[PDB]
């Protein structure tokens, strides 16, 4: 499955994953592509954070899906 990942700027990335792929796995493919560490990532879709462990099948994330990549951050 060919999915797209739009950055919080414009640049996009095409990851060749599948429906039985786990989010964590996807983040891994992103780290190998760019260089950002998982712990420093946050996939959002339809205005909602995608928890880890789950798969692209749970969110019904089909092909040509533009995932909104963001960088989470602690607070207080």
């Amino acid at each position: 499955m060919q999915i797209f990942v739009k950055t919080l700027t414009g640049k996009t990335i095409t990851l060749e994953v599948e429906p039985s792929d786990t989010i964590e796995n996807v983040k891994a493919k992103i780290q190998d592509k760019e260089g950002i560490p998982p712990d420093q990532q946050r996939l959002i879709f339809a205005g909602k954070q995608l928890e880890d462990g789950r798969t692209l099948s749970d969110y019904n994330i089909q092909k040509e899906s533009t995932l909104h990549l963001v960088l989470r951050l602690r607070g207080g």
Partner: protein, 131 residues
Amino acid sequence: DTKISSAAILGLGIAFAGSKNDEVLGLLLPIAASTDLPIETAAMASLALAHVFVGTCNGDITTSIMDNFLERTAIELKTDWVRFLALALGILYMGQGEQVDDVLETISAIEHPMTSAIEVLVGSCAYTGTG
């Protein structure tokens, strides 16, 4: 070389100027709603957002713009910006119905940083809201 950004946000603002698409608030929101973002584009972006949707409005916009206000920690550096945050968040409203009243209540719901200065500015100027 921090400057190309100003050229971007500028064009965009003039791009979807009169259209009210979906890709606008789609990426603009996060830029100033995601989770703590460089006051460099955060403020600017926000401005443009209101600039276009200066007329109409909605809750999602507020609920969001608010989420950022909280993720705004003076961890970056010392600089004046209350001029923008106030402006936008200001014109953002114009109707009536203890609307702005609730907003201020939120700012209080959390801690109490320098923002307090704003609590007075707005808290002061506003439509009747006594008993």
